[PDB]
Amino acid sequence: RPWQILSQALGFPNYDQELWWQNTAETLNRVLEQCDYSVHLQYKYLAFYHKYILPSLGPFRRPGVEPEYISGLSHGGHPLEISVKIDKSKTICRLGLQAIGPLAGTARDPLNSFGDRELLKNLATLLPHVDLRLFDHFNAQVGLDRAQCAVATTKLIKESHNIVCTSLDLKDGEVIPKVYFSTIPKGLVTETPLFDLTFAAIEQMEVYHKDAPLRTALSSLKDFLRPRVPTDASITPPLTGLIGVDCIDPMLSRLKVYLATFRMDLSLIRDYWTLGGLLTDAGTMKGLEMVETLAKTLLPFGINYAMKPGTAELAPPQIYFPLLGINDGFIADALVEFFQYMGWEDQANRYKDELKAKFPNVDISQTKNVHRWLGVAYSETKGPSMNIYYDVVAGNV
Amino acid sequence: RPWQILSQALGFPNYDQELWWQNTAETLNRVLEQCDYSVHLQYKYLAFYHKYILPSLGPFRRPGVEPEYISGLSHGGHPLEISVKIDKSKTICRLGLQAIGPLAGTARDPLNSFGDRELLKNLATLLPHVDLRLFDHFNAQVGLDRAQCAVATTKLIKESHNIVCTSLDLKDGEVIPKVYFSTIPKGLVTETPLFDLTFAAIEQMEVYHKDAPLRTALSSLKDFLRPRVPTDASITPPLTGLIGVDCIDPMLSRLKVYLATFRMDLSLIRDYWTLGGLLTDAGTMKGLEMVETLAKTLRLPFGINYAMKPGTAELAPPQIYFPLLGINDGFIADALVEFFQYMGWEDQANRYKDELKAKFPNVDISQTKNVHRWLGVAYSETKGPSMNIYYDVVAGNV
Amino acid sequence: RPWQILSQALGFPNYDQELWWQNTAETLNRVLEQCDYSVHLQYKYLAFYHKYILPSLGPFRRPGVEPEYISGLSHGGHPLEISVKIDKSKTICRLGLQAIGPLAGTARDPLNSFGDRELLKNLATLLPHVDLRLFDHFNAQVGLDRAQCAVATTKLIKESHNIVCTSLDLKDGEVIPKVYFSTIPKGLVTETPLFDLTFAAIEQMEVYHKDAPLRTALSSLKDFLRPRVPTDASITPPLTGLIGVDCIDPMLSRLKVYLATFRMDLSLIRDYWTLGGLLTDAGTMKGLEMVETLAKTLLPFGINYAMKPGTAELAPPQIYFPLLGINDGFIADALVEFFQYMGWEDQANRYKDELKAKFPNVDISQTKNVHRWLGVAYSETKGPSMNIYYDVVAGNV
Amino acid sequence: RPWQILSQALGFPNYDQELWWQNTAETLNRVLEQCDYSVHLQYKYLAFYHKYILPSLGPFRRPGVEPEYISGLSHGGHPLEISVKIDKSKTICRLGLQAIGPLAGTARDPLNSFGDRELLKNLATLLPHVDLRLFDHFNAQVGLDRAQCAVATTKLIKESHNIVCTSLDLKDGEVIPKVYFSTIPKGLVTETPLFDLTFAAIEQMEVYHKDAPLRTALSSLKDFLRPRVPTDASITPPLTGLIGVDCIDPMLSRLKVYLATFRMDLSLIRDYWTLGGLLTDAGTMKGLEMVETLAKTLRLPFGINYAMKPGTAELAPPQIYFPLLGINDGFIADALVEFFQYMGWEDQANRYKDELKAKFPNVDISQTKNVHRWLGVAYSETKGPSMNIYYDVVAGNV
Ligand SMILES: CC(C)=CCC/C(C)=C/CSP(=O)(O)OP(=O)(O)O
Ligand SMILES: CC(C)=CCC/C(C)=C/CSP(=O)(O)OP(=O)(O)O
Ligand SMILES: CC(C)=CCC/C(C)=C/CSP(=O)(O)OP(=O)(O)O
Ligand SMILES: CC(C)=CCC/C(C)=C/CSP(=O)(O)OP(=O)(O)O
């Protein structure tokens, strides 16, 4: 199998990398097989993962070895998730990580401020269409100096000592990077409202200055958000907690504004999904029915508003449900049910057996940490989709 | 001597780093001695240089070995300069380089777009006061993607295939980084006027949005520049060719707008120095007299660098850079002696020549015309007059 | 194709590595395909080649860039050859290289004394059955200190400033390393006879002390060689110029003693092949007829005497014919003829078309440097075989 | 101070290297000062240490972070010691380490078989007189393949999962490497007597084949050892546990055979020191009196190290190593003062305690029992008496 062949051919520079491979790569290869990637792409993505991602992952937290940097991306503190994005017809695999610098979580780098960009630089000489300009824009607007990073660490739990996260879509035959910047450290240290910071960073983008439609969409979103998030500097959910961009040509990149909140019920889902009554069309409502059904059939909730240059009008957000603490066999049975409801019979009929085969070392009827998040979306052009995020290390140990 | 001891202690990871050391470090150690740095700071800076700068300099261009990336920073194509900044009371040493990535000047990195930031990241875990926000801001506004970088290379000579360069001030026992971003590649690829792209990038700075005084100073500079630099997309002089920032807290960083031009005479000097009559105070006029005198005493373009600080509403006189490539270095030394006497810096005058010879022991500097590359002169209200002398260190050694 | 997929997935740390890949890896992948390696082994070997060999190859000599170290392994000074070993039924691909240290050919490393062992160390943590003890034994007996290496360089042409060479057999599904140590630098600097040095280094092996049969074989070989190679310190071919070992368990390793000479004619072939009349059996003679025929149908000639612990009796050597300067289309037509004579009809019928497909950038009817060496062997148990060494860079530029 | 300046100039590639520096370099700089190394040599050695030794030390074992490889070189499992060698006229500093590979103590490298050679290769391009031939010889004779290394790990406690270690003498402004190869893993895996495997490896040396005098000295040592060490395959004392060489021209290298044993009293000391009566000369007897006196003034095994040089036919007295782990370090300091007075080294006696406290400022050395780990004593016909004091530097700092 590719993951075994690459281990034979490449070995490992060090033991943490070897332990990362032994705890993730068989799962990754399985996901790729299940999603119908050809063998040549399996090799491509696994070889890429070996060379670029393994060294980015830092030490492998395990009994007796407590790293200096502890990630919020997973239950055991490992800076890695693997996700799938499921349509009617097809499934795409994606990696989410934090790239860990070698002084991360110590005085010289308290918020792991440098590793992700270093990874992106290696990707920019690897891949012709990687563009770092929006990364650099937002790193400039929300990043902090060393002293400020140290102040932020005294105000934040260990699992939130970060400023950026990276995801890599393994799509078509390419690697497509996207990043998310956190607003909280800058809000805490500057005592500036999260809302003001978020929109000020956005309004200073080059593309915002050139694109009237984006400015119109952003003004509707600010109207919607202003009354719903804090006006003061407090970290009171609901709040504008992340800004996401795609590492592509800025005029093509989707700009994402992510809300985090700890309350969700039907009223709130409806409010978020329709932007308080702004969106009342049939596509929107069909999406809403999906999301309501999913909630009935079934960490903060997330709401992600995505905007593109050239589009004046806002769409429904993607909504993220946290699943940590809920039985993974229950979740699987629920998703089978939801897939049937969506008419995705094939996905329903394979979901549970494929889930087990992804995570052979664990008994999913006994685990509660393997499914970590579920995202749901509905797009006027693309259709409905569902994003499932897995704590791959929890699924392997 | 420190440069020799460090060569013995540390060796070299490869032969290009060894050649960079054998052509630069003895000079650098000399400069630091001549500037009255203590032995401990000589070690600090030479060890820093070995660890951080040698790998950043890439291959050492030499007969039989042509790198893929050729720098415009020096005559022989070497991405390094060493400068001194001279006052009444003190002299400080500065390094200027381009950090060369390992695929620089090839399809995967046509304009060497990544090495300087990588160096800066390493400096940010080394030094507590290094700040990358303004670097990242301007890299975002004036940097180009790979395909654009490839287009730019078809429109620029090999020595101008760059977007950024870095200087490191070796001051107060610290290393203070500053960078300069080139506007030309973006201007060429986007067919936008240099003046428009320069000020649009500046106007999107976070600090510009928060600081009324900086906006006001910028606004006076634009009024001065707009009728003097092109309004079209042409690359013709005087032009806004570089944006400089200091890699420190954005609220403390000096923002620089550098003009390049070929034409200079006393009336242009006055125009640049006084911003066409805007500045008429005694300090300004005393400065002007100094700069005129230097010009009389004395091909690359002239430079004119307008430096602005958040919290300051008013423009000061720029620093003026005289290009010295092609002029005999013994003449330049005699000219500087003369100028130092005129400023009343007798001690600097009496040591300049002997010190120059001792900086460059492997070459006869009276026979060279490329060792002195630039001379910058400045006057400050609070700080006094200063002179910046930029040396092509490799031309001084090979 | 694997070589293209790996280039997409891995990129290159630097431009010399990229140029090595662009001048060799398509050829390598072609060789592996032609030899019926499965796709999974093609990936294994090409990924291995990317990770381990590319950085070992040093700079890529090209117009305007003259490295400090110039290899004798190829016509353009590149430290690389690809060879095939052909039987009746099957063909095996092998890599020959010098691993170039980053100070090679300069005062701090005048004879490139360190790179090969550094490569072997990385292989010893990659591959479970790699054994370095014989490497270290011979490096101890024939290696030189810095001053001695500098003296040797004043007495040797630039293309012979080396002490070790490495080959990697890509066999079964493994990588099997072998090395060759040169005796000449130590002979020159110490003014010791090459014969004395060679046998003294051998007689100090641990396995020689434990294995009576090897000592008996070695005593017959010394009897045969003593009158034929110099008794003085001169570098007068015929001479004992290399010692070869396999980097495996010393009790399994073949020990090789390689003679170089500039004269070969029928008398001498017969003398070398039969060890001056010692070997007169039917297998030996059948081998001799092969070798004579090959010579008629068609750098020093080489003669390689291989011995194994547990075997008291010497076998016929492998004989190496240099082909540099001879037309590569002529060579191909000759080999087709020789293959037919051996009854290897299938090999004959595909040789020329496969050769062209290995080296598509060149016209083999116009080149004289692509075939560099040919080795012929006959083994009592294994049968006849032929080793063809290609200047892969000459075949690509 | 140099250790601080280098930390400022160089920083650290990772947090384990930073912790190694923060627990060792201040001590090391102190030792070098105390030994009257000039500031330039202090820089030379501390910069060398930063570049070459810090990466070789692997992870810094500490609460919450357990490495895969645990060294027997120190009490806390840290692969580092610092020693001083004291004469009448001078004191020199030595580093002892294991160079830890990145897969050490795991399936791909169970006995850390590659790191020390890799360090030595880097030293061989750094320093002109470093020679790897004897290293490679003994690595060939006593080193093991992966499967054998895995077998050995099942028969040895974690702290003895090693085959080699390295010392670096910081002498004459140079770095002089030496190594010690363990015989036990080969003895265990092959079930061969340690005595037989030790001498078979020695007897295959190129220099042994060329040097009649060394063979003769070896022959006298074997006669002495054969009735004292086991004839069977057992790992019981006194045993031939290490072979030491200097990484120099084989014809100049001292070959060492190190015995380990637990039992010592005055009659055993005499036996080891005189080789059971073989040596009876005045120098030898004067040495013996010294060593007896030290023993009276004063768990790891005792060591006895027999050092032989090509061209010398006759055996000299060994160096004897007293194990000091578990004994109070204030007592040891008082004992050494007493011994120094007895040797007539008044100045060394008068400074020993104060200097010890200044070497280890972060710990109260009067409360510790692991900081002094070994004390070696030697007498040489030509050179005089000497004392080697080995410190667990990390135990002196944490
Ligand atoms: C770890 C935190 C803060 C939230 C977990 C959920 C998460 C990382 C959503 C990322 S948005 P994304 O995966 O990029 O959604 P798509 O546009 O790729 O479909
Ligand atoms: C314009 C071209 C071709 C190269 C750049 C010229 C150059 C080295 C400008 C340096 S300005 P700088 O050294 O930063 O002067 P200060 O403001 O530090 O006094
Ligand atoms: C470059 C020089 C000195 C000779 C060229 C021929 C050469 C390298 C023969 C190697 S012997 P080898 O390839 O290992 O023969 P096999 O036992 O592998 O069949
Ligand atoms: C025997 C065990 C458990 C560890 C080795 C003990 C050790 C550090 C011996 C060093 S002998 P050494 O420092 O080389 O003495 P010198 O001959 O240099 O005077």
mmCIF file of N, CA, C and O in Angstrom, chain C residues 75 81-82 323-329 331 351 355 358-359 362-364 366-373 388-397:
data_model
loop_
_atom_site.group_PDB
_atom_site.id
_atom_site.type_symbol
_atom_site.label_atom_id
_atom_site.label_comp_id
_atom_site.label_asym_id
_atom_site.label_seq_id
_atom_site.Cartn_x
_atom_site.Cartn_y
_atom_site.Cartn_z
ATOM 1 N N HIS C 75 31.271 11.053 -18.420
ATOM 2 C CA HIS C 75 32.010 11.851 -19.367
ATOM 3 C C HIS C 75 31.954 13.341 -19.013
ATOM 4 O O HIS C 75 32.963 14.002 -19.108
ATOM 5 N N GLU C 81 26.086 6.952 -12.502
ATOM 6 C CA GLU C 81 25.825 6.029 -13.591
ATOM 7 C C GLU C 81 24.583 5.214 -13.232
ATOM 8 O O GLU C 81 24.256 5.035 -12.051
ATOM 9 N N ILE C 82 23.811 4.802 -14.263
ATOM 10 C CA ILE C 82 22.774 3.821 -14.030
ATOM 11 C C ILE C 82 23.185 2.608 -14.836
ATOM 12 O O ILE C 82 23.567 2.756 -16.023
ATOM 13 N N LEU C 323 33.703 1.350 -23.042
ATOM 14 C CA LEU C 323 33.032 1.615 -24.326
ATOM 15 C C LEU C 323 33.031 3.076 -24.740
ATOM 16 O O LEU C 323 32.435 3.411 -25.758
ATOM 17 N N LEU C 324 33.650 3.930 -23.936
ATOM 18 C CA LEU C 324 33.712 5.359 -24.196
ATOM 19 C C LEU C 324 34.460 5.537 -25.514
ATOM 20 O O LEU C 324 35.454 4.885 -25.745
ATOM 21 N N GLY C 325 33.973 6.402 -26.390
ATOM 22 C CA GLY C 325 34.609 6.596 -27.692
ATOM 23 C C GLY C 325 34.040 5.705 -28.803
ATOM 24 O O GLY C 325 34.264 5.947 -29.959
ATOM 25 N N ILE C 326 33.296 4.667 -28.475
ATOM 26 C CA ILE C 326 32.700 3.816 -29.520
ATOM 27 C C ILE C 326 31.256 4.201 -29.744
ATOM 28 O O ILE C 326 30.515 4.422 -28.775
ATOM 29 N N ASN C 327 30.850 4.292 -31.014
ATOM 30 C CA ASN C 327 29.474 4.583 -31.402
ATOM 31 C C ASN C 327 28.380 3.749 -30.685
ATOM 32 O O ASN C 327 28.387 2.531 -30.668
ATOM 33 N N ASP C 328 27.425 4.441 -30.066
ATOM 34 C CA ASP C 328 26.399 3.783 -29.254
ATOM 35 C C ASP C 328 25.395 3.000 -30.076
ATOM 36 O O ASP C 328 24.844 1.999 -29.598
ATOM 37 N N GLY C 329 25.144 3.450 -31.310
ATOM 38 C CA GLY C 329 24.317 2.624 -32.239
ATOM 39 C C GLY C 329 25.093 1.376 -32.648
ATOM 40 O O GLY C 329 24.524 0.316 -32.737
ATOM 41 N N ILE C 331 27.320 -0.164 -30.774
ATOM 42 C CA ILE C 331 27.262 -0.983 -29.571
ATOM 43 C C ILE C 331 25.924 -1.677 -29.497
ATOM 44 O O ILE C 331 25.846 -2.876 -29.195
ATOM 45 N N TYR C 351 16.337 -4.779 -27.301
ATOM 46 C CA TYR C 351 17.457 -3.985 -26.752
ATOM 47 C C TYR C 351 17.514 -2.593 -27.337
ATOM 48 O O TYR C 351 17.464 -1.632 -26.587
ATOM 49 N N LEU C 355 16.642 0.944 -25.619
ATOM 50 C CA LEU C 355 17.749 1.871 -25.373
ATOM 51 C C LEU C 355 17.356 3.294 -25.804
ATOM 52 O O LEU C 355 17.635 4.257 -25.114
ATOM 53 N N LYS C 358 14.984 4.836 -23.345
ATOM 54 C CA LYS C 358 15.681 5.250 -22.127
ATOM 55 C C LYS C 358 16.236 6.691 -22.309
ATOM 56 O O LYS C 358 16.248 7.474 -21.375
ATOM 57 N N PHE C 359 16.771 6.988 -23.487
ATOM 58 C CA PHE C 359 17.495 8.222 -23.801
ATOM 59 C C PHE C 359 16.909 9.024 -25.015
ATOM 60 O O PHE C 359 17.623 9.287 -26.022
ATOM 61 N N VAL C 362 18.551 12.074 -27.164
ATOM 62 C CA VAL C 362 19.790 11.916 -27.874
ATOM 63 C C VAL C 362 19.505 11.014 -29.057
ATOM 64 O O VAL C 362 18.526 10.270 -29.056
ATOM 65 N N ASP C 363 20.381 11.054 -30.045
ATOM 66 C CA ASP C 363 20.305 10.164 -31.203
ATOM 67 C C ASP C 363 21.389 9.178 -31.033
ATOM 68 O O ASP C 363 22.530 9.543 -31.221
ATOM 69 N N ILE C 364 21.073 7.912 -30.703
ATOM 70 C CA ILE C 364 22.182 7.009 -30.354
ATOM 71 C C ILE C 364 23.094 6.631 -31.494
ATOM 72 O O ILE C 364 24.246 6.210 -31.248
ATOM 73 N N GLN C 366 24.431 8.811 -33.257
ATOM 74 C CA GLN C 366 25.436 9.889 -33.253
ATOM 75 C C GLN C 366 26.256 10.062 -31.994
ATOM 76 O O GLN C 366 27.199 10.831 -32.008
ATOM 77 N N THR C 367 25.914 9.357 -30.915
ATOM 78 C CA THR C 367 26.637 9.499 -29.634
ATOM 79 C C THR C 367 27.698 8.438 -29.474
ATOM 80 O O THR C 367 27.586 7.346 -30.036
ATOM 81 N N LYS C 368 28.730 8.765 -28.713
ATOM 82 C CA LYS C 368 29.740 7.799 -28.355
ATOM 83 C C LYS C 368 30.006 7.710 -26.825
ATOM 84 O O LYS C 368 30.899 6.989 -26.408
ATOM 85 N N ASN C 369 29.211 8.398 -26.013
ATOM 86 C CA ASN C 369 29.453 8.351 -24.559
ATOM 87 C C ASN C 369 28.382 7.769 -23.656
ATOM 88 O O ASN C 369 28.649 7.664 -22.438
ATOM 89 N N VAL C 370 27.251 7.358 -24.230
ATOM 90 C CA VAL C 370 26.109 6.876 -23.452
ATOM 91 C C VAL C 370 26.386 5.481 -22.826
ATOM 92 O O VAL C 370 26.184 5.303 -21.613
ATOM 93 N N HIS C 371 26.888 4.513 -23.619
ATOM 94 C CA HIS C 371 27.342 3.254 -23.067
ATOM 95 C C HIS C 371 28.748 3.540 -22.541
ATOM 96 O O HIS C 371 29.618 3.935 -23.301
ATOM 97 N N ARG C 372 29.000 3.335 -21.268
ATOM 98 C CA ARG C 372 30.323 3.610 -20.770
ATOM 99 C C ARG C 372 31.112 2.339 -20.484
ATOM 100 O O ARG C 372 32.318 2.308 -20.711
ATOM 101 N N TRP C 373 30.452 1.284 -20.027
ATOM 102 C CA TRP C 373 31.130 0.049 -19.654
ATOM 103 C C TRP C 373 30.197 -1.054 -19.932
ATOM 104 O O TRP C 373 28.948 -0.900 -19.859
ATOM 105 N N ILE C 388 25.496 -3.584 -18.079
ATOM 106 C CA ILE C 388 25.678 -2.450 -18.999
ATOM 107 C C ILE C 388 25.583 -1.152 -18.166
ATOM 108 O O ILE C 388 24.580 -0.915 -17.567
ATOM 109 N N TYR C 389 26.609 -0.325 -18.194
ATOM 110 C CA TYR C 389 26.673 0.913 -17.467
ATOM 111 C C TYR C 389 26.470 2.085 -18.388
ATOM 112 O O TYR C 389 27.212 2.287 -19.339
ATOM 113 N N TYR C 390 25.499 2.919 -18.040
ATOM 114 C CA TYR C 390 25.115 4.094 -18.854
ATOM 115 C C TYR C 390 25.440 5.405 -18.182
ATOM 116 O O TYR C 390 25.259 5.572 -16.933
ATOM 117 N N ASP C 391 26.010 6.310 -18.979
ATOM 118 C CA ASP C 391 26.237 7.696 -18.572
ATOM 119 C C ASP C 391 24.890 8.403 -18.761
ATOM 120 O O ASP C 391 24.589 8.940 -19.829
ATOM 121 N N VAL C 392 24.039 8.280 -17.750
ATOM 122 C CA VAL C 392 22.674 8.765 -17.779
ATOM 123 C C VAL C 392 22.586 10.269 -18.066
ATOM 124 O O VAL C 392 21.783 10.703 -18.908
ATOM 125 N N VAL C 393 23.508 11.059 -17.517
ATOM 126 C CA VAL C 393 23.491 12.499 -17.818
ATOM 127 C C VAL C 393 23.835 12.742 -19.308
ATOM 128 O O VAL C 393 23.168 13.535 -19.919
ATOM 129 N N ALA C 394 24.836 12.034 -19.874
ATOM 130 C CA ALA C 394 25.162 12.120 -21.309
ATOM 131 C C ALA C 394 24.010 11.714 -22.186
ATOM 132 O O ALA C 394 23.786 12.346 -23.220
ATOM 133 N N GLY C 395 23.177 10.802 -21.694
ATOM 134 C CA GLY C 395 21.986 10.331 -22.383
ATOM 135 C C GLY C 395 20.767 11.260 -22.332
ATOM 136 O O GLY C 395 19.720 10.957 -22.909
ATOM 137 N N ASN C 396 20.875 12.343 -21.545
ATOM 138 C CA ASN C 396 19.754 13.232 -21.304
ATOM 139 C C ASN C 396 20.042 14.651 -21.754
ATOM 140 O O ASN C 396 19.132 15.429 -21.946
ATOM 141 N N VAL C 397 21.267 15.016 -21.963
ATOM 142 C CA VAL C 397 21.493 16.485 -22.160
ATOM 143 C C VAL C 397 21.444 16.847 -23.651
ATOM 144 O O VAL C 397 20.623 17.768 -24.009
#
